[PDB]
Amino acid sequence: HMINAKLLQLMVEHSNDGIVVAEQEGNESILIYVNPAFERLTGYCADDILYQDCRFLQGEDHDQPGIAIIREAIREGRPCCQVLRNYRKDGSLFWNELSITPVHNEADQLTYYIGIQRDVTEHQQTQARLQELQSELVHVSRLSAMGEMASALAHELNQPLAAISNYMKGSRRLLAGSSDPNTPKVESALDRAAEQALRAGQIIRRLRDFVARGESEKRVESLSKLIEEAGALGLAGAREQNVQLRFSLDPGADLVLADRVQIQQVLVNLFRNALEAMAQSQRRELVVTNTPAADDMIEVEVSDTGSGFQDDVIPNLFQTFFTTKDTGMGVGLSISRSIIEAHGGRMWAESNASGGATFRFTLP
Amino acid sequence: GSHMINAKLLQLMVEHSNDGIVVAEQEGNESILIYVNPAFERLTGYCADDILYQDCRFLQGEDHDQPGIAIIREAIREGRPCCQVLRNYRKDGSLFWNELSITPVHNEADQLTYYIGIQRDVTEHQQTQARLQELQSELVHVSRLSAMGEMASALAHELNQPLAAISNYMKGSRRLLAGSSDPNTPKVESALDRAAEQALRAGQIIRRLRDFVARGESEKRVESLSKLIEEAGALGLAGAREQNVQLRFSLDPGADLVLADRVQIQQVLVNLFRNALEAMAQSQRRELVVTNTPAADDMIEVEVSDTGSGFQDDVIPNLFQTFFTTKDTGMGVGLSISRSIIEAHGGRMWAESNASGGATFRFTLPAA
Ligand SMILES: Cc1cc2nc3c(=O)[nH]c(=O)nc-3n(C[C@H](O)[C@H](O)[C@H](O)COP(=O)(O)O)c2cc1C
Ligand SMILES: Cc1cc2nc3c(=O)[nH]c(=O)nc-3n(C[C@H](O)[C@H](O)[C@H](O)COP(=O)(O)O)c2cc1C
Ligand SMILES: Nc1ncnc2c1ncn2[C@@H]1O[C@H](COP(=O)(O)OP(=O)(O)OP(=O)(O)O)[C@@H](O)[C@H]1O
Ligand SMILES: Nc1ncnc2c1ncn2[C@@H]1O[C@H](COP(=O)(O)OP(=O)(O)OP(=O)(O)O)[C@@H](O)[C@H]1O
């Protein structure tokens, strides 16, 4: 009615989406029409596949749940939409998003199907890599958090336990020049206490090294790449926070020597920290910049126009547990600085002229 | 001339496609609708007789601050196809997310530019994906502090004995020295007192770090088991479809409502889900069953069974022990944290090996 069927067929012939019309023959849903987009998407020529069921796109990959879903939809005559792994003529893998509508033709007294196919490989791939990045971020965050927990405990307890040892040493020195009948019992009690204090030391290290066990290696990685991976994790939601992102990367300074999951976590933490300082900020600008630097290093700058620093907050930032947030562990910057310095770099912070914060670090 | 099928048949298929399909026509800066299928009238709530020969942009309502709109405008300015999601609004005002595929097509007879547009309602995917973004952030935060907290509790528990020992050896040494006249004894006693004070200080500063990390604590509310199971699946079980892992959630409608702290039970379930997937990595059978049932003393029992690596004969009684692990990079902390959280809540928790060589974990929660 509304448009002539020739024109409509022309539109179908030239749609960018795969479009096919199938016909049920017993247990087969045989293709009776395909458009060029479908030939492109699959690599098959229409002259070759007509009057067969398209399941050959599955190749040998028949342990997919969508397949059974589709089969039951087709038995019921209900529509259905499913993603499947299909394989082009040349073998190449693509994820095919299938929308099938059973349609009953009264004249033919037959059941046809109209199917729309979109290649969704890029979405599947990016979503899978984002899942792996999310999982590994969780893993490394947990071990590194317990790992800083241990080091702070060791360094804070190091003084009392040594004091105890020294008081044992001095007491034993005083009692040596004594004949009181009870002193051998005193000396043995003091020895047992010494041993217990050593035991406290030895087992603080035991839990530390169990949580800190298992370390990685440093390889050449592109900062553009690790900045994009870190942004994918840390900066989703900037647009909803109306934060303006600017990545100024120097093409001569892009390749660094680093352990990629740890630098990912340094950048993710810096990005999150910057977003938080912009929670209620009138100006929201985030700048990431790479430049050549002095000691054959390369400097990465992350600047925000956020809450910034009070007069004497700035010199505490990288100290373990120093925090201004109600639920902050104050550990992000401490872990980041220890990681960067172990990688051969330097890290420091300063307030920006816009009232925000600028963090810089260097890597080779 | 090549006609694989009569155009009437093709028109019918389009008429009954479950997908919105429209044909628009270029008139200057308008792409006016000249055909819509019933699917589009349903999806949008508008009647063809009313929207024909207008541009579809009225679906944006007042919500024109979307990037996809400018993307589409440029694609249509060039001759290129494009695909974008928009916030559109039905006739009744209701919001829906519309997945648009537009293909400009040039008609030689008309010497005109038409467009074929395919529209999918994808509200559920956009919303679900945004809720997974929210869950990912909270899982990171809660895992970090929760691990720091089990770290803290473990260090305090192991140190409790030596520090008490030191305090007691001081108390006993002072008792022995009380009856003494050696000239040096007041100096000894003062040294022992200072050592006592240092050991107390070690204790108090361990409690200091423990309380600092556990300072973020919450309250427990009535929560739907379907929902918290789905959030945990969304985080932990996202890869099962590609791992060819068979998932089955059998939830009993008579056993559904619990009292819990939702983020902590989420982290318990996420750990169970990942752990089961890890066991079912290289197993010919990989089937995971989650089941809800009523359980004794006004409780509800949840079962998670896997056909995975399972448990050795005497590993089972170690599972809930802090730091007990079999994985090279594992912390052995997941189950210890999980059991302490559930028991700190109103339930209990235990484990057993599965008959398929896998593992089955069960827990109970209240509904009071
Ligand atoms: C119109 C239509 C299009 C289809 N397109 C595809 C496709 O592109 N790729 C694919 O793997 N399966 C596709 N299928 C599914 C198979 O034809 C078949 O129905 C499905 O694999 C379940 O049937 P089975 O029991 O033979 O496996 C399509 C089905 C229909 C009706
Ligand atoms: C075939 C076709 C279908 C369209 N369908 C929709 C739609 O369903 N919802 C929507 O918001 N925009 C839709 N658009 C986009 C608008 O028609 C318009 O192209 C877009 O809003 C950008 O143009 P503008 O600058 O006038 O806003 C469609 C465009 C075409 C060509
Ligand atoms: N861009 C910034 N703007 C303002 N303050 C910042 C910025 N970056 C860091 N800070 C300050 O430095 C402190 C330390 O941050 P750090 O990331 O080390 O821990 P945190 O974010 O407080 O805790 P968590 O371990 O949960 O991330 C923060 O409390 C914050 O006050
Ligand atoms: N579903 C499961 N299938 C097989 N083994 C399991 C399962 N759940 C737990 N285990 C075993 O119990 C041990 C303790 O697991 P838990 O989840 O507490 O810590 P983990 O997985 O070792 O460490 P992490 O905290 O890093 O996940 C694990 O090493 C694992 O061997």
mmCIF file of C-alpha atoms in Angstrom, chain B residues 91-227:
data_model
loop_
_atom_site.group_PDB
_atom_site.id
_atom_site.type_symbol
_atom_site.label_atom_id
_atom_site.label_comp_id
_atom_site.label_asym_id
_atom_site.label_seq_id
_atom_site.Cartn_x
_atom_site.Cartn_y
_atom_site.Cartn_z
ATOM 1 C CA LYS B 91 3.853 8.389 22.088
ATOM 2 C CA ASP B 92 2.862 7.846 25.711
ATOM 3 C CA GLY B 93 6.124 9.545 26.725
ATOM 4 C CA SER B 94 7.842 6.369 27.915
ATOM 5 C CA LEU B 95 11.586 6.153 27.337
ATOM 6 C CA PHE B 96 13.130 3.401 25.255
ATOM 7 C CA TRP B 97 16.608 2.796 23.863
ATOM 8 C CA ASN B 98 16.451 2.418 20.067
ATOM 9 C CA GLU B 99 19.142 0.597 18.054
ATOM 10 C CA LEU B 100 19.083 2.226 14.606
ATOM 11 C CA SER B 101 20.676 0.903 11.430
ATOM 12 C CA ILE B 102 20.294 3.358 8.562
ATOM 13 C CA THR B 103 21.401 2.678 5.012
ATOM 14 C CA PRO B 104 21.214 5.474 2.446
ATOM 15 C CA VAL B 105 20.251 3.993 -0.898
ATOM 16 C CA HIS B 106 20.166 5.985 -4.122
ATOM 17 C CA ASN B 107 17.240 5.317 -6.471
ATOM 18 C CA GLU B 108 18.219 5.887 -10.087
ATOM 19 C CA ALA B 109 14.655 6.012 -11.453
ATOM 20 C CA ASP B 110 13.504 8.609 -8.906
ATOM 21 C CA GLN B 111 17.015 10.068 -8.944
ATOM 22 C CA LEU B 112 16.386 10.390 -5.222
ATOM 23 C CA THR B 113 18.015 9.287 -1.997
ATOM 24 C CA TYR B 114 16.011 6.913 0.168
ATOM 25 C CA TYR B 115 17.020 5.270 3.417
ATOM 26 C CA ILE B 116 16.171 1.913 4.935
ATOM 27 C CA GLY B 117 16.167 1.947 8.709
ATOM 28 C CA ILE B 118 16.001 -0.998 11.082
ATOM 29 C CA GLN B 119 15.042 -0.368 14.717
ATOM 30 C CA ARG B 120 15.424 -2.659 17.753
ATOM 31 C CA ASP B 121 14.275 -1.887 21.265
ATOM 32 C CA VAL B 122 17.421 -2.516 23.316
ATOM 33 C CA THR B 123 16.336 -0.948 26.613
ATOM 34 C CA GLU B 124 17.149 -4.100 28.547
ATOM 35 C CA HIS B 125 20.713 -4.357 27.246
ATOM 36 C CA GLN B 126 21.572 -0.698 27.882
ATOM 37 C CA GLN B 127 20.109 -0.820 31.394
ATOM 38 C CA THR B 128 21.704 -4.175 32.239
ATOM 39 C CA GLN B 129 25.082 -3.001 30.882
ATOM 40 C CA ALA B 130 24.889 0.168 32.983
ATOM 41 C CA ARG B 131 24.062 -1.868 36.092
ATOM 42 C CA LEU B 132 27.036 -4.070 35.403
ATOM 43 C CA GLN B 133 29.196 -0.933 35.232
ATOM 44 C CA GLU B 134 27.847 -0.059 38.710
ATOM 45 C CA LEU B 135 28.571 -3.591 39.989
ATOM 46 C CA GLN B 136 32.132 -3.638 38.658
ATOM 47 C CA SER B 137 32.978 -0.469 40.578
ATOM 48 C CA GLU B 138 31.481 -1.754 43.810
ATOM 49 C CA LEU B 139 33.143 -5.169 43.498
ATOM 50 C CA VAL B 140 36.563 -3.539 43.231
ATOM 51 C CA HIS B 141 35.977 -1.346 46.292
ATOM 52 C CA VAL B 142 34.525 -4.131 48.428
ATOM 53 C CA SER B 143 37.135 -6.712 47.454
ATOM 54 C CA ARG B 144 39.931 -4.252 48.264
ATOM 55 C CA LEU B 145 38.716 -3.252 51.711
ATOM 56 C CA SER B 146 37.400 -6.751 52.512
ATOM 57 C CA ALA B 147 40.772 -8.311 51.694
ATOM 58 C CA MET B 148 42.605 -5.664 53.715
ATOM 59 C CA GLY B 149 40.220 -6.572 56.531
ATOM 60 C CA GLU B 150 40.795 -10.306 56.439
ATOM 61 C CA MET B 151 44.490 -9.478 56.250
ATOM 62 C CA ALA B 152 44.089 -7.425 59.429
ATOM 63 C CA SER B 153 42.110 -10.070 61.314
ATOM 64 C CA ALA B 154 44.615 -12.755 60.354
ATOM 65 C CA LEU B 155 47.632 -10.779 61.530
ATOM 66 C CA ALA B 156 45.969 -9.914 64.829
ATOM 67 C CA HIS B 157 44.965 -13.547 65.403
ATOM 68 C CA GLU B 158 48.448 -14.900 64.771
ATOM 69 C CA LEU B 159 50.128 -12.225 66.879
ATOM 70 C CA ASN B 160 47.684 -12.513 69.809
ATOM 71 C CA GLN B 161 49.641 -15.409 71.332
ATOM 72 C CA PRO B 162 53.274 -14.140 71.315
ATOM 73 C CA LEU B 163 52.237 -10.690 72.599
ATOM 74 C CA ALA B 164 50.233 -12.265 75.415
ATOM 75 C CA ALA B 165 53.213 -14.520 76.109
ATOM 76 C CA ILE B 166 55.492 -11.500 76.439
ATOM 77 C CA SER B 167 53.051 -9.762 78.762
ATOM 78 C CA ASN B 168 52.822 -12.870 80.970
ATOM 79 C CA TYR B 169 56.593 -13.389 81.125
ATOM 80 C CA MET B 170 56.861 -9.779 82.283
ATOM 81 C CA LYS B 171 54.172 -10.279 84.947
ATOM 82 C CA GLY B 172 55.909 -13.438 86.181
ATOM 83 C CA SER B 173 59.399 -11.915 86.122
ATOM 84 C CA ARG B 174 58.120 -9.008 88.190
ATOM 85 C CA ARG B 175 56.582 -11.457 90.637
ATOM 86 C CA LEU B 176 59.926 -13.239 90.942
ATOM 87 C CA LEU B 177 61.855 -9.994 91.388
ATOM 88 C CA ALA B 178 59.434 -8.480 93.922
ATOM 89 C CA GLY B 179 61.194 -10.394 96.665
ATOM 90 C CA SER B 180 64.681 -9.186 95.813
ATOM 91 C CA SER B 181 67.296 -6.883 97.286
ATOM 92 C CA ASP B 182 69.853 -6.844 94.468
ATOM 93 C CA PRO B 183 70.906 -3.216 93.892
ATOM 94 C CA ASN B 184 70.058 -3.471 90.190
ATOM 95 C CA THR B 185 66.487 -4.651 90.600
ATOM 96 C CA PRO B 186 64.628 -1.313 90.272
ATOM 97 C CA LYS B 187 66.373 -0.775 86.954
ATOM 98 C CA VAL B 188 65.380 -4.275 85.836
ATOM 99 C CA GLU B 189 61.780 -3.713 86.932
ATOM 100 C CA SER B 190 61.604 -0.402 85.062
ATOM 101 C CA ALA B 191 62.971 -2.031 81.902
ATOM 102 C CA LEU B 192 60.416 -4.835 82.151
ATOM 103 C CA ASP B 193 57.639 -2.287 82.603
ATOM 104 C CA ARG B 194 58.716 -0.411 79.487
ATOM 105 C CA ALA B 195 58.796 -3.718 77.566
ATOM 106 C CA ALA B 196 55.277 -4.511 78.779
ATOM 107 C CA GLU B 197 54.137 -1.105 77.541
ATOM 108 C CA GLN B 198 55.739 -1.673 74.146
ATOM 109 C CA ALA B 199 53.914 -4.978 73.727
ATOM 110 C CA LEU B 200 50.599 -3.321 74.608
ATOM 111 C CA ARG B 201 51.462 -0.657 72.035
ATOM 112 C CA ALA B 202 52.021 -3.307 69.359
ATOM 113 C CA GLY B 203 48.613 -4.731 70.130
ATOM 114 C CA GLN B 204 46.822 -1.408 70.139
ATOM 115 C CA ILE B 205 48.294 -0.324 66.811
ATOM 116 C CA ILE B 206 47.296 -3.590 65.152
ATOM 117 C CA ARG B 207 43.758 -2.938 66.401
ATOM 118 C CA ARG B 208 44.224 0.600 65.039
ATOM 119 C CA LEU B 209 44.893 -0.602 61.469
ATOM 120 C CA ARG B 210 42.149 -3.245 61.660
ATOM 121 C CA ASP B 211 39.547 -0.687 62.739
ATOM 122 C CA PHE B 212 40.732 1.814 60.120
ATOM 123 C CA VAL B 213 40.112 -0.571 57.240
ATOM 124 C CA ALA B 214 36.894 -1.978 58.732
ATOM 125 C CA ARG B 215 35.563 1.557 59.375
ATOM 126 C CA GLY B 216 33.348 1.214 56.321
ATOM 127 C CA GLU B 217 30.455 -0.932 57.562
ATOM 128 C CA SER B 218 26.788 -1.158 56.640
ATOM 129 C CA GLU B 219 23.380 -2.537 57.677
ATOM 130 C CA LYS B 220 21.452 -5.563 56.423
ATOM 131 C CA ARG B 221 18.040 -5.292 54.721
ATOM 132 C CA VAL B 222 15.384 -7.486 53.137
ATOM 133 C CA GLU B 223 16.700 -8.485 49.696
ATOM 134 C CA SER B 224 15.334 -10.613 46.857
ATOM 135 C CA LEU B 225 17.387 -13.722 46.165
ATOM 136 C CA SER B 226 16.658 -13.633 42.418
ATOM 137 C CA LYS B 227 18.172 -10.120 42.254
#
